[PDB]
Symmetry: D5
Amino acid sequence: SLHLSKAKISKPAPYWEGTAVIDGEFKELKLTDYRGKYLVFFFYPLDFTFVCPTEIIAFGDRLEEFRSINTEVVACSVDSQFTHLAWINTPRRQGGLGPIRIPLLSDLTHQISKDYGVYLEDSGHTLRGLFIIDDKGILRQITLNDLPVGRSVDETLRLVQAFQYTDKHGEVCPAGWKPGSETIIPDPAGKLKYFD
Amino acid sequence: SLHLSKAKISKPAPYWEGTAVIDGEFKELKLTDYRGKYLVFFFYPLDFTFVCPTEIIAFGDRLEEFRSINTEVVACSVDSQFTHLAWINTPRRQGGLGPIRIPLLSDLTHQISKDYGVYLEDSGHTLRGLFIIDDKGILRQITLNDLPVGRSVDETLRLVQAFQYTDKHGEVCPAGWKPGSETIIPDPAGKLKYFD
Amino acid sequence: HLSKAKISKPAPYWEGTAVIDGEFKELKLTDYRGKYLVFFFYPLDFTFVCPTEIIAFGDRLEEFRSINTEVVACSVDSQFTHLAWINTPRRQGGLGPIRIPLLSDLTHQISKDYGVYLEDSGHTLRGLFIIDDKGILRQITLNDLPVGRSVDETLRLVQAFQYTDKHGEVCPAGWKPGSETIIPDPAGKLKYFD
Amino acid sequence: LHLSKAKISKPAPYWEGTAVIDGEFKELKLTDYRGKYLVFFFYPLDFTFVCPTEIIAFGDRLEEFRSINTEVVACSVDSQFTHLAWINTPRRQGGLGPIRIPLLSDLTHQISKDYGVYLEDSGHTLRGLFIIDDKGILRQITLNDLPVGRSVDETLRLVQAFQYTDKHGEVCPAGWKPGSETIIPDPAGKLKYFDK
Amino acid sequence: HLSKAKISKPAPYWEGTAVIDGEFKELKLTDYRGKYLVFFFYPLDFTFVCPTEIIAFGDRLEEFRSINTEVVACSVDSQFTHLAWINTPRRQGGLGPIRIPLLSDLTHQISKDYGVYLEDSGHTLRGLFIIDDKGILRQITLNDLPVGRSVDETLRLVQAFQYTDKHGEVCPAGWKPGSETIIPDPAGKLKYFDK
Amino acid sequence: HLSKAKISKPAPYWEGTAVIDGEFKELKLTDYRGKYLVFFFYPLDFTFVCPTEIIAFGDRLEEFRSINTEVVACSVDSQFTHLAWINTPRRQGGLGPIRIPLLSDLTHQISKDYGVYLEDSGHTLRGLFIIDDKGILRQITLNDLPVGRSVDETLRLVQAFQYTDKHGEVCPAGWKPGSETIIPDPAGKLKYFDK
Amino acid sequence: HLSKAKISKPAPYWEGTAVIDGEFKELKLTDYRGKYLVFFFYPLDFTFVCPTEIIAFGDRLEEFRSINTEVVACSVDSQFTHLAWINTPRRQGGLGPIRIPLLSDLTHQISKDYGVYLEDSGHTLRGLFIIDDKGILRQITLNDLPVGRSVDETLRLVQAFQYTDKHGEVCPAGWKPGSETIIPDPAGKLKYFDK
Amino acid sequence: HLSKAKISKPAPYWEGTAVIDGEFKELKLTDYRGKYLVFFFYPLDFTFVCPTEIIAFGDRLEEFRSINTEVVACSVDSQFTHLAWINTPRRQGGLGPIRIPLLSDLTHQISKDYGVYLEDSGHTLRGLFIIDDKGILRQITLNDLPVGRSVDETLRLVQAFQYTDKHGEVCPAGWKPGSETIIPDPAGKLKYFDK
Amino acid sequence: HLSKAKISKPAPYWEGTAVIDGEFKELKLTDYRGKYLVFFFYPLDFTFVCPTEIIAFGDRLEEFRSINTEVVACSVDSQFTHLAWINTPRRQGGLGPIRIPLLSDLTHQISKDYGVYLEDSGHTLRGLFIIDDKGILRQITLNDLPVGRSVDETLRLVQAFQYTDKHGEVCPAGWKPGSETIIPDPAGKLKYFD
Amino acid sequence: LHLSKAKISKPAPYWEGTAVIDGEFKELKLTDYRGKYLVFFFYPLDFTFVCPTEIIAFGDRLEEFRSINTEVVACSVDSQFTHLAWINTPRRQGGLGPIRIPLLSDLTHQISKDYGVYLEDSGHTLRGLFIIDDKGILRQITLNDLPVGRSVDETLRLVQAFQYTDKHGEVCPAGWKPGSETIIPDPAGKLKYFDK
């Protein structure tokens, strides 16, 4: 036994489609609906659990920071749309989500999880996997966390900003780059402007 | 064609061994040398390039922040040990590394890169892949960046700290957790202490 | 169409996490040896026909228990979702507290072994299995999604299998306790048919 | 492993053969029944025990099916010549006497095997009943071990229920009979049923 | 076209439920070791040529038993149909009481092993097998559906094989008890041909 | 055991050199279309039971011809051997003149196709085949080596197949021309059985 | 073209029934160990070139026996055919009495092993094999059907193999007993060639 | 053991470089259509029996050419070694000038196609093939290493095949021009055997 | 051991990035049609025998160019490492500026096609290939790691192949321009041997 | 594709056969040469052109190899009988005359094929030369197309070089001959050679 997935960095993100809960309603959603925008596509283990609601809420409460840089966010677990909706209709105080502006996509058949290489065969759900997909549908970044440890909205934002910067300019982003940081001309002569 | 690797989160990190440059000298190095400590094991594309030296230097200048939490750092590219050494002997001003305290591991056969799933078959080198491996040799975290965008030492530190926290305590780390942040008892009754 | 479930052969082994009296417990088919088991799958928590079936069996559990029969319900939902559904009031389509274990089949292994998994939907249809005290599968009832099962019919079948286990005689169409039975012999059958 | 071509919500597997209908041999085809519901049932063996009671039970209540546009066909592995002899045997001798339900012959066993009801060790079927709708789709499968007969009441209840759900945008609760409350399968609409 | 039945090899083993004297009994081929056996298949219970053949052998069973030979009939019908047929009077195409076991081959395994199963019809053709006291298949006769077998011919063949088992001579065309036989030797044969 | 001969299917095609009226001729199964054919194998020229069978049929050939039926015999021997055997007087176990073609199956292909070839012996058993005017195999009779076939039984079978080809009725056990037949119908059959 | 016969390897084992002095005997290749054997196939009994070859060798057998060499002939015909052919006078193309065994290869296995079997004809070509006292195949001669072999050439070959088995020298083209031979050495050979 | 060479089929095609009249020339089997060809392999240049055989055929080539037959010799040696051997005087085991083409089979393809290659030794045995004017293989003679072939026997065989090509009669054992032949007919044969 | 490189067959096609006059350029085997090519692999940049061989050929390039022959060196190193090595002074084991292209084989495809890739080491041995103006492979020289090649021997071979391409005659052992040649004919060869 | 068993730095493929040695046939084995260096070379064909010049070139300079503990063996597909005739042919006739180098025969072609020098279209070898060390390891492979002979000088230079590097911890630069400067294969030690 060894690890298989369709997700490859610099190649089109694996196509997905299914039912999502969007503003309390069931809707058809597909990867290609986001063509033209960056997409932060992330999986979480299970509705009605622990680290999961904090990550959905963390992104959800900061959604405008993504939308103002032309970036959408979609969360996905193996739960049904009916469980997603019941979880949204559970108050935050009870480990619920409350109203949420991020689509919750359902992957009940597990095909989307397997395609993205985040499915845990022994558990029947996913680990914490996040995928940054560009406006052309190309996969740029993959972040996979073991179960006990949540993700960072700050780090996700920095990555989206850096990919959009390098999309638009001839230069590349050094370690720890934030908007306004110095960049490098990827040329053996050009690079010296940065290194001096 | 689809994506293969031996690296699986919650399973032992794929074994590796080879020649590294360690304090200007060639030495035998192997994954199991780090048993007993956390390891941040990361690949970078190519010696004498652009984003690569900034990431090695960023980690290298902050190495004591890793060592004080019982964590080592190893960098790896497909370059030979001789190229690594020549790069270390190149002043930072010329895009060189200068003296460095992080081992530079050589993966000339590409077997280590393929095992870790970071090898780019069309390019002959790796993308930017970072792996956090615990003191028991188990893989906890995988971060893969497309070429133009460097990694973050801050985010790597936060992850190491969070994994070590959840190793030691019964609780799990919510989104954006830093030392001193609130955590959750992964219990449907216990969790309410956090959510209230 | 493939399955391990075959009438008159041992029921396919299963094990997993169930919610039992509000708590997570490991549950196994072998825990039921010595008793009859009604083991049924329903599609999805927080749906429509499913709560009515679970509630129907739960509220009538004593009619099974007084004839040495237990009842277990299973869906592909997680134990965390099972528990949330139980903590949801009946008038909201929830289960309320419930005396029947809710087995979780997240990996879909159990559903596939039993032949009830719908590949294109990601959940089960309405599949019910009657398993005897020796662990042998006696009865399979599979319903399409829109139509619920009958506790009365399920009880009748359990009683009939128990009657025929105990007695040398067999059970005619519609048999209920107190109805005529047949000696399965070419000469003996005549006492029934005359 | 158990193989079968019968799958709920797919076309019932096609069959054709010789049946005894009103004392005569006739070619009978599953497609003869398009436009009507069909109760299609297998019984182990002619000149046995539970089998005649099930055939007579359905036969004597046949107008109850015919008034809801539903036909009934019985099948065993016996030849048509044996079916005809069994019919010509008085009910008091465990014969059928005259009957209005066709007795389909499956001498080659291909029909039994297609329906997943054939017993390889025994050479005849178990007690398998199949409810097929007017569009030829399989809706319901009931398999009994040998000792225990089926119920006409229950078969009637199921036919009625499938026909109700075909016509209405509502679904049938546990134990539903004509005149019982039904549910709207929507997370908001469902409450009309549950609030009670 | 395949079967396990080969002349001069052990007849393929069989076992199943037969109706014997109105009762269900387990019957096996090895129950006949030490006797010749005429083992024959017929298409279907409650048909036409089949009852005449079963009755013809049954009514003449002593002609077999007095030469240490038994007769068993087999079809794909169940033992319950066999018994019903037996309980049907001859005038109605029934068998009446019968002294020959009626073997049931519901699973079709025996028929296929004997190479007599018709895949398109779900029953056997008219196949008859003569098996010696050591269990070796000596003779195979297979008829299409419309034409019954001959008890006289079957008797002739059993008698011929028993004669050749016992003596060193072989049986000419049309041989009956009392007929001339041949010494199977290029010199010895001349005693027969020079007449 | 493998063969292409199956009852109710076209008899397997054969062609080869036969000795006919002391001459070598090409003969084909399809030469016989439009008439019944009795096609039978015998083990070996210059042996024992084999000549008696060829002579038995040959001496009674007009009984076949007068019911539109031909007879062809076949062994694995060459046509040169067949002709020598015909040219050997009956009293030395020879055939003498004969009116039945002796087909040669030197390559063994015909014997194998008919499932009568004995791999350990290099020759056939005694296999007889009745083939109708349409080329359909109707009857198969296989004898172990020591026991010869019967001309009477062969005639009876051919007459019975021709009767059932021509009429709606089927032939009971032991049927001969003039015997009662059965209407193969649950109602019609009662004419025969009601006794 | 497939065969097990290879020069300088053990001749392929054979066994079968042969006619020897008018009797059927089991004969085996290994019966001939310790002597040379001329083993030859001929197409068919009761034919044309075949009897002349058998007679040619048979009439000159003492020339073989006196160099410790036996002769065995084989065709696909049966032993019964072989005996009839021996019992047919030479003037009718028969063999008459003969002192060479006639081996029967009825199953065709021996012919196939020797690569002489003609699949389209069902019999062999004219293949002759010279096998030494150790069972090693030394010589292979295959003729198409129309042309017979030579007893003189066969003797010459056997004498030459026996000479080279016994001496250090090899036999030139056309060598007969008494002819010059060659020392198979770059230096030694010059004794022969220096002319 | 495998080869493409089969009697009564087209001889396997070959082509390569031969030494002809001291020169290198491309030679192909089809260059001989319209003539008989004696095509023979010998183990190795600069050996022992081989020069005697090549010289024996060469010195007698007119005996072939006057019956419309050509002779070609072949070994696995290169054409350069063939020419060196030719330029070696006979007294030294050389060939001297020769009128027969010496074909080179360095790749071994021709030898393997003809079934004469010895895998353990890297050269051929002594294999001779007679091919008719239509290109059909008529005769195969294979000798173990120590024993040469006969020009006289080869001539006899070519003459016999040409005789049987031309006339309807076949050649008895030891046939030479002038000898009695046989009409291949069971009646016609009697004109030969009755003498 | 597998390779696509076969003497007297077209040299295996290659293409990749080379450093040529300090810049990255796409280079292809087909760019050399019309000329002889000396195409050689060396193990690794910043090593020991390798710079001496590259420098030996570079400093003597005119001896190849004046006979219509070009020279290309290849290792598994990146073009970025090739360029750094060129920007390293000779006295430090660097190449200094160089007039011979340095082809990069990072993917190892070219090395494998040429049969010179060492699986356990991740780089090539010392493999040199002489390819004629029609793109046909004429000569293969493979050295174990510790021993460098000879520009004098390589030049001799190029000259000999060019001589025999032009003339009907062949080149004896040790042949240099001006040495005796042989007519490859059994009669003609005698003018040489007498 | 080109197949061969000959690999540099692995044991030279074993061979054995009949050779002509001092006018006589003798069994010769690769392992006869253990303890000594071996120059093992193939030539196309006896009684040809370049081949005799190479054999004589090596033969006349054989003491130059013998004084450095190195033996020479030549091989072609010709038989031993042809080798012997060629030897017994005067040099003036393109013969070899007497020679001190064994001529190994490879009639079956197995040796040529094992060494990857056999030409399938032609049935003989190209000009392949192999330098095998005293431990039986293959060090050097030189393959020439047919028209062009090999050099004894160069073969000598290579033998000397491999023997020098076997004994010393230094390696041989391009064009090395006895008495030439060598390099210490260490990044520090190398400078002693390069600083010049």
